């Protein structure tokens, strides 16, 4: 479909163009200067994303499973409704107010089983 | 690109009963469906445009309303001169961003 | 508003029919729109260009094998190619304008193939 | 339960720093710009709405900076022109002329440096009335002696607009609407992205809007708001209407040089008869033209509601007249001839003005002057729209103008900046 | 043998020297403004590499093998003559022009694996 | 604790506060040009922790194990007293001056496994 082309898809279709999207989010006059600046937050982005995949433990992956619980108050749906009956852009609106609690579950729960590999 | 089903297929009252005709489409054409009358042998006559309004002439007893992906003319009372099939015009294209009269579903008397 | 052309044509034929404004000229507000109905069948949309600029959109089905065109202020034609048995059907112009259907229509043509 | 996606199809509302892309030290350094993509691909998004609003449209004010950022840069390493503010001798030009340019051309004496720190020389230059102030043959100033530098524009450096197309960083995308029928404000679902715009041309004008884009399916109106009579009115015309500028006189031009290593470049003499300045626009696409607009406006008002496009506001030049950027040359043109109709139920000549000290920003700051050009201009341009302000039957527009952070604004008003955020969350049936 | 020391030498026997190359990829006067023309252009270099490692499922690895067949027509030789009596610059302008497909195939072949991880 | 917070801990504790440090780590007048100076330093800086860690064959890991023995002569102790009874200040002063031969051995044993999978 080409770059975001999925973005009015369905949420479980949408997981195939994965690779689309990330694939395009890397790269003294007036128009000089900008280009410095345009060029470092082009990687200053790119990398805080990698460096949150990293910590996870979602390195090198476009998809990742863990192993954090759902709570269901974040949102008190089914998944054959949010998988087959939504669009990512609604999904993200509606449980935006809760991913600062989500990361914080999925980095502490990395921690802990790097401990684990003490005994191998 | 484009659907659109009309569903009531050969319906027919009395005249002083009533009928309705529907369609429906897979893309939102909010606000952009024309309905059109055509009697044997004539062109069409327009006779609602952007779901609810009536063209001039057309007579009272032509109405109808929706949006979305859901719409319905109505006739509040046969009158004999309803020997006809109408049909359901979309006036949006949603790939070019204009509004011309593009695409028919139809055929219900 | 009036139209002409028409006629019986054979497998392979090309047909230009043309229509033409009755007491209007084309200013910029309309659009010109082609419709098909062959004689057992409801209608179809062919093709609509709009006066101003020229700009015109078609069906996917009539692609490559229909063109519409403004030759004058008060002239537009649809010149038809590669015809077969199967184009044989009233063809209709009407007049609409952006935001509705088309609301002043002629009588139409007859094409047989 | 939980499973992370990386590469999600979403984004927020976002403001980031644009660049350009484009294709002679022309004046807004185009050849430090970097070359664009060609044929850049365009992507439909299917099943999306979003909403626009082009009066915060953040582009907007980094295309106004940018280009006055330009214009100040390109005029730096220039000569100074401090040393031709003296008294100035003056007598009126009556040799060759029309009746109606009486008056509108002086003679100008002066003592002026020569290389040499030690001597002076006599040298006279023509000047147009509107840069001469009289002091008390007669004395006379330049306009600006008691406001500001003038500095004179380097002769190499072209005016003529080039186009400019802006765009987004990686990370970054801009949302292109195709909605035709779209007022400025609000949902707008025909919605395609591209990453770098088509370009757009730094027109410098008032009250008309030329070589712009047209619209299509209607002339549109837009404002921020119809019934603030504070707001102005913006009309996009969906075909063109073409003018022919002209001189027309044909000047000379030559060098006096007022220091080592500087010259200052004096209008001669004029060869043949000196006429008038003027633009004609054709009369009966005006006449067409003008009354599409009002039969659109209209639907704001009623169908009751008489139109009348009566005359100018009144003011300074540069908020009353047609100021127009050609050929090098900066003109002030008569509207009035324009806009004089009411609207119930051959060619037009406009007699135009030409100044050399010019004020481009309405600011004040730095003036530039303009140096002459040999020969005869003639320009050719596309009206593309105009803007209007409106003042118990009858409502009154005229054409208003004069703003900046305007113009552009009828280009970009198409285009939103977001910002792609690629992670996000979801709930499955899997585990490690 | 040192940076590109192995430049002129076997395929094969080039691969043990991967490490040396990749280890030296990364990092208002004349002389001041570069520095940062420099610094910017080494840090996005390396990160597209690393992009492109990272979507075909390499990440972390100076050599990762994958899923997709060779396709004889890029290069009708067998393994004996590419590995023992070739240099990489020699291998490299032979198929340097079918570079992009074979990175397509390296991506879409990573995705369609990671659907068929819904399964665990 | 919060950042640094682990400094005056115990080397064993602190290895939980990993987390901690690793997600600080990453991001023309007098106080304007200073901030592409920032800006590039800090990424170039963070890039570089990365490229070792992926060298070693430890990416993704705050903590990773590897197959390089002891040597002794680093530093004679026993495993309780510098896990139990030093904080990772006085550790690293300790060992500072073998960092460089512990890095050369971490790579090259990456790159010895790597061959090991041309059976695979
Ligand atoms: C709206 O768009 C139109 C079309 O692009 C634009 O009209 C064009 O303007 C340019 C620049 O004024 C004209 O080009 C000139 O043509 C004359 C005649 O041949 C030449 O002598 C000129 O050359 C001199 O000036 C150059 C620039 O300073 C120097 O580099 C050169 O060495 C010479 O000294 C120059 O080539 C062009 O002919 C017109 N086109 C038409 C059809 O008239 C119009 O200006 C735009 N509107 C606005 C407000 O800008
Ligand atoms: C826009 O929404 C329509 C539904 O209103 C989507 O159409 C469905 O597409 C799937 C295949 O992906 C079919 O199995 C369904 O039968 C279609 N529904 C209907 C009513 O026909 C359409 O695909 C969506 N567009 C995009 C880009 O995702
Ligand atoms: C501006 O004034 C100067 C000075 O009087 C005019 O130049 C003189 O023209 C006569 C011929 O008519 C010559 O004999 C003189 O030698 C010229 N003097 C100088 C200093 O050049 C000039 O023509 C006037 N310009 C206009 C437009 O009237
Ligand atoms: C004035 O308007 C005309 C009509 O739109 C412009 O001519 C068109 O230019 C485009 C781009 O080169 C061509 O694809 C069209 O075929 C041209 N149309 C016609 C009828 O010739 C013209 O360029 C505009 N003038 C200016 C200065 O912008
Ligand atoms: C340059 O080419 C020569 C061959 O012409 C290489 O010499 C061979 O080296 C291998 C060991 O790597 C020996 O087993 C062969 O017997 C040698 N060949 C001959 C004819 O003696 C030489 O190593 C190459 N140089 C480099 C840096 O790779
Ligand atoms: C600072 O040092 C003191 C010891 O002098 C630490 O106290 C010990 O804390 C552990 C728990 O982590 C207890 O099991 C011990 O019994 C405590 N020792 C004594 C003598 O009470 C203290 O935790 C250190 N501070 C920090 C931040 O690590
Ligand atoms: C010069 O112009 C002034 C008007 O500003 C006029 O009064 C005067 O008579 C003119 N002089 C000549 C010689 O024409
Ligand atoms: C130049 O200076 C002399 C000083 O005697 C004065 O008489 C003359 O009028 C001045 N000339 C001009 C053109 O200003
Ligand atoms: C002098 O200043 C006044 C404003 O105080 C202005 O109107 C006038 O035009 C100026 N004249 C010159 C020659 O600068
Ligand atoms: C644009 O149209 C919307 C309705 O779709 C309306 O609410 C809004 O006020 C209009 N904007 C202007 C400036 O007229
Ligand atoms: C404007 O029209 C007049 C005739 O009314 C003609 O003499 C003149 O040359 C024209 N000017 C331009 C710039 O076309
Ligand atoms: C402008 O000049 C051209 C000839 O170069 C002519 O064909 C055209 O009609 C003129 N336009 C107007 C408005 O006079
Ligand atoms: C031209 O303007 C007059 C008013 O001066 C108006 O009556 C006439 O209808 C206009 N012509 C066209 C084609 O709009
Ligand atoms: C038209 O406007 C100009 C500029 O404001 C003014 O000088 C002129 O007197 C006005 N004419 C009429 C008839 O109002
Ligand atoms: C425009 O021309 C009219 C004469 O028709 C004149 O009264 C008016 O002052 C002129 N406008 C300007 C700004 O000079
Ligand atoms: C406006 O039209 C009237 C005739 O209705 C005419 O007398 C007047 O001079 C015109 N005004 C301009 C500026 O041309
Ligand atoms: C101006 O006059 C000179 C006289 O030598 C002539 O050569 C030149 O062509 C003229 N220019 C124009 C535009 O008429």
């Given at each position: ?120 | ?26 893309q939102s054409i909010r606000s952009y469906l024309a ?14 445009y952007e779901a609810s309004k ?13 949006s979305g ?21 979309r006036n949006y294209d949603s790939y070019s961003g204009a509004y011309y009269p ?8 | ?26 200013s910029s507000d309309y659009y ?18 709009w006066t101003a600029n020229?700009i ?40 609409g304008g952006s935001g509705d259907g ?12 | ?12 509302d ?30 439909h998004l299917?099943?999306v709405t979003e909403e626009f609003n082009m009066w915060k449209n953040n582009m907007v004010e980094?295309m ?110 801009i949302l292109k609407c195709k909605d035709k029928k779209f007022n400025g404000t609000g949902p707008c679902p025909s919605v395609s992205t591209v990453?770098?715009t088509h370009?757009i ?6 009250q008309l809007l030329?070589?712009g884009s047209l619209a299509e399916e209607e002339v549109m109106i837009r404002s921020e708001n119809i019934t603030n009579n504070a707001k102005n009115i913006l009309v996009q015309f969906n075909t063109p ?48 033209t003008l009354g599409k607009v009002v039969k659109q406006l209209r639907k704001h008002f009623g169908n009751?509601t008489?139109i009348?496009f ?33 609207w ?39 009206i593309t729209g105009l803007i209007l302000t409106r003042d118990?039957?009858?409502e009154t527009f005229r054409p208003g103008g004069?703003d900046?952070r305007d113009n552009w604004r009828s280009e970009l008003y198409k285009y939103k900046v977001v ?14």
């Open positions: 479909l080409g770059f975001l082309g999925a973005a009015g898809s369905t949420m479980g279709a949408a997981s195939m163009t994965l690779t689309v999207q990330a694939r395009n989010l890397l790269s003294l006059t007036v128009w000089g200067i900008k280009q410095l600046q345009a060029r470092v937050l082009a990687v200053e982005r790119y990398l805080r994303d990698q460096q949150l995949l990293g910590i996870w433990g979602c390195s090198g992956k476009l998809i990742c499973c863990t192993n954090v619980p759902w709570n269901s108050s974040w949102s008190n749906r089914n998944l054959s409704e949010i998988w087959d009956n939504m669009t990512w852009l609604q999904w993200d609106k509606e449980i935006s107010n809760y991913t600062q609690i989500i990361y914080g579950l999925l980095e502490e729960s990395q921690n802990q089983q790097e401990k684990n590999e003490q005994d191998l | 690109d484009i659907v659109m089903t009309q569903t009531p297929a050969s319906v027919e009252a009395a005249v002083g009963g009533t009928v309705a005709i529907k369609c429906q489409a897979s309905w059109y009358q055509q009697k044997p042998g004539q062109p069409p006559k327009l006779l609602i009536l063209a001039s002439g057309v007579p009272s007893r032509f109405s109808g309303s929706g992906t859901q719409f319905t003319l109505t006739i509040s009372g046969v009158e004999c001169d309803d020997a006809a099939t109408y049909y359901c015009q593009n695409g028919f579903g139809g055929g219900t008397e | 508003l009036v139209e002409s052309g028409g006629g019986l044509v054979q497998p392979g034929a090309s047909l230009t029919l043309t229509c033409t404004a009755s007491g209007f000229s084309f010109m729109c082609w419709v098909r109905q062959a004689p057992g069948k409801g209608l179809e949309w062919i093709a609509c260009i020229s015109s959109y078609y069906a996917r089905w009539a692609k490559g094998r229909f063109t519409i065109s403004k030759t004058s202020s008060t002239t537009v034609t649809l010149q038809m190619t590669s015809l077969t048995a199967a184009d044989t059907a009233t063809y209709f112009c009407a007049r088309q609301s002043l229509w002629g009588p139409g043509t007859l094409v047989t193939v | 339960w939980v499973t992370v996606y990386y590469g999600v199809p979403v984004w927020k976002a403001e980031t720093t644009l660049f350009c892309a484009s294709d002679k030290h022309n004046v807004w350094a185009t050849h430090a710009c970097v070359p664009t993509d060609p044929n850049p691909q365009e992507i299917e099943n980094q106004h900076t940018d280009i006055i950022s330009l214009w100040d840069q390109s005029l730096k390493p220039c000569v100074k022109l401090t040393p031709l503010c003296v008294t100035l001798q003056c007598t009126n030009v009556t040799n060759n002329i029309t009746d109606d340019m009486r008056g509108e051309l002086k003679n100008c004496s002066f003592n002026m440096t020569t290389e040499l720190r030690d001597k002076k020389q006599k040298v006279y230059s023509l000047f147009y009335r509107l840069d001469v102030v009289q002091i008390n043959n007669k004395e006379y100033r330049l306009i600006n002696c008691n406001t500001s530098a003038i500095t004179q524009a380097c002769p190499k450096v072209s005016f003529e607009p080039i186009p400019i197309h802006y765009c987004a960083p990686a990370g970054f995308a990453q770098c370009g041309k730094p027109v410098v004008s008032t030329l070589n209407v073409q003018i022919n500028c002209t001189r027309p006189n044909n000047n000379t031009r030559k060098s006096i040089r007022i220091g080592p290593g500087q010259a200052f470049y004096a209008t001669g003499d004029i060869i043949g008869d000196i006429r008038q300045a003027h633009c004609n626009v054709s009369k009966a696409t005006w006449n067409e009751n008489i009348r009566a005359n100018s506001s009144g003011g300074d030049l540069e908020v009353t007249t047609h100021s127009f950027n050609c050929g090098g040359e900066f003109f002030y043109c008569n509207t009035s001839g324009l806009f004089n109709s009411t119930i139920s051959d060619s037009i000549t406009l007699p135009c003005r030409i100044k050399q000290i010019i004020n481009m920003w309405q600011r004040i700051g730095q003036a530039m002057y303009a140096p002459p050009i040999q020969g005869v201009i003639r320009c050719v341009s596309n118990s039957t009858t004069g900046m910002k792609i955020e690629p992670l996000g969350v979801a709930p499955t049936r899997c585990k490690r």
